[PDB]
Amino acid sequence: VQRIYLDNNATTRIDPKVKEIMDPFLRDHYGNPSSLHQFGTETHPAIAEALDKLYKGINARDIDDVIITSCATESNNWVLKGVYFDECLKKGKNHIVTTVAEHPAVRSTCNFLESLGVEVTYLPINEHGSITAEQVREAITEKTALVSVMWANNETGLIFPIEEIGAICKEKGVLFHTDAVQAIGKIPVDVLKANADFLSFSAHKFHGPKGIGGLYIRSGVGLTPLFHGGEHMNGRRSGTLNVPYIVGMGEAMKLAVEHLDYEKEVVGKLRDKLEEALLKIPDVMVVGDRIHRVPNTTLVSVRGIEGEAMLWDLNRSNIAASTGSACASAHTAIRLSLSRFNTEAEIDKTIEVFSQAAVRLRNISS
Amino acid sequence: VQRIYLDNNATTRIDPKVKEIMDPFLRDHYGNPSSLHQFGTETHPAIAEALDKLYKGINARDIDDVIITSCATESNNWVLKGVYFDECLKKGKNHIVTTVAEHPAVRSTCNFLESLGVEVTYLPINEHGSITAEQVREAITEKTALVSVMWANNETGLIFPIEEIGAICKEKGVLFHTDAVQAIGKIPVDVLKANADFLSFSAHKFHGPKGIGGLYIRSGVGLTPLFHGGEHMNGRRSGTLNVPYIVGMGEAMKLAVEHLDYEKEVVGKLRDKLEEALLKIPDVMVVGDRIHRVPNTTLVSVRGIEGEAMLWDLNRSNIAASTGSACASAHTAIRLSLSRFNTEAEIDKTIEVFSQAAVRLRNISS
Ligand SMILES: Cc1ncc(COP(=O)(O)O)c(CN[C@@H](C)C(=O)O)c1O
Ligand SMILES: Cc1ncc(COP(=O)(O)O)c(CN[C@@H](C)C(=O)O)c1O
Ligand SMILES: [Cl-]
Ligand SMILES: [Cl-]
To answer: Which residues, in sequence order, are bridge partners of residue A2?
Structure first.
């Protein structure tokens, strides 16, 4: 059996170099880095190289922190609730502005904060598919504690006017956070260009293991810890370090940025090949803008066929893709998200199987 | 080089069967369980067997939840802060009772809760080395939201009068939580005998990977989530599942309980061998009770030699142990904590190296 994985915005395959670099810390070098003997200290070099790969991966400065978390969801919860106790409760700024397209890790936590009496403006999405950057400008009152905007959307792949919103947040003097999970590995990420005080990212989206993530914190920005115990990570996130996953996530970061040119020149080209081959068929239109998109994702709608149906028939031919709410009723569309491991042959066969399914389910609808 | 690891209360070695069972989910079966295609569903059986190994490992019922967390520190933070928003803020019960020997993951979070205006009684430790169970009885006011007591101490190995305290907490109708990290693998753990509403445990203490843990929640007990997003784990802890670490932690639980008789009949006997061989030398006395201790840990003090000194000289001979504050100034003592992989030969050589060091540093003190 030869199956084709086109759902890399749900999770990615661990790169062999990553599993490679992780194995020894699951095998013989199992010491706790917080220990003082050679079993602990023995682990510090590889840890430092990992963190340096991260700093250099997002262009963070040695003055800043790149705290290692359990996942991007922990990073988002820690940002929202931390700036809640920090600014909303203890500085009055009882307002947070974000988008309606944020991951449930953001939207749901902001919903909890509304439950705590916080006023939140969820910025409406336009027809182009992204935020204007001026929506936040007209949105920032004088009691906004934070602006949170994802770097790129997980369903549509649409990049957002970050860097611009970073400049606006610097101007009005307000905290800036970006869920950058779908940006790492796809497009370059610069915390300094973005004027971001907080940045989130999850490892299993650039071919690292699930269950580890990272939160970037600019120098001087305070964030009341989500994990108390105050021993690890300058006290900001307690708990024994996931040494293996840390190392492998450093290597996953490195390999991810070393394939950026490959991601746009090759992976994006296969995206254009598949997508363009797919809209040559009756009633199918891509959801959202096509120009400012991450190279690897396309989200297309189909005739009078729900997304889950094409997911089922595609699954029966061993091709994996997700759904994605689209335009209006929702109706659910197909999200196909490539990676650096897919080939053109897989793409041709995905167009074959796709068209066969389209006329199959489309004909059976009568 | 042959080095001897006697710091299993800091972390343990991943059992080969665990790395074995984990490998495929780092290799070919990398799908996100939240996905609907065969890559996601393909992972559900091994996940279910893992969770069943956990439930059966702590004698939890199918009605209860055993939520998978990032570590025991996340579990403790989630318990304290969750019952804070649940009971202290929204039921007035602005009081929490715990011990002074709790892990910093507990004590530090309770310190944060005091910062939020919560009254906390940190129960004093006695000369026997444990809590009375009646200390909580005389401590439970009518506005206590929760009692938190570790099952066994990480520095001394002393088991605590759990089950008794569980009965007291059932009587006065108050929430009961136990940090059971040092109990798993060492002694049997029964949530039903303990009348515990919340139980914490970390995986890397029974030969699983660092960076995954578990929190047991009795049926009907509400706990406002620390991770919002509400997709995973009945919504109580969002974030993509650490499929590999979940599987391996299930197997680590299983193998841990299948070696309980070996842990007491063999590992405890090697503990008694080393410890008894060690107090035959001048001014050294074990810290705390010797009867009700986990089979694997001993904490001994030495003459006029700080603990860190013996740690250094032992490290130079490639033997790993930790410290542990003891009695009075502190002075710091030696914590040696065994595992199921140590042999008698290692113990004899640890007594040799130990005595040589004792007279070495002891003589140089003049
Ligand atoms: C009782 C107890 N609870 C919780 C923890 C922390 O577990 P995590 O790192 O997975 O959150 C520990 C670690 N102890 C080690 C640090 C020691 O005592 O040396 C512990 O002994
Ligand atoms: C932008 C973004 N942030 C955060 C997350 C969650 O990451 P963790 O599970 O490591 O916390 C995701 C996952 N997306 C997947 C679920 C999807 O869109 O299908 C995401 O796309
Ligand atoms: Cl918090
Ligand atoms: Cl909370």
So the answer is: none
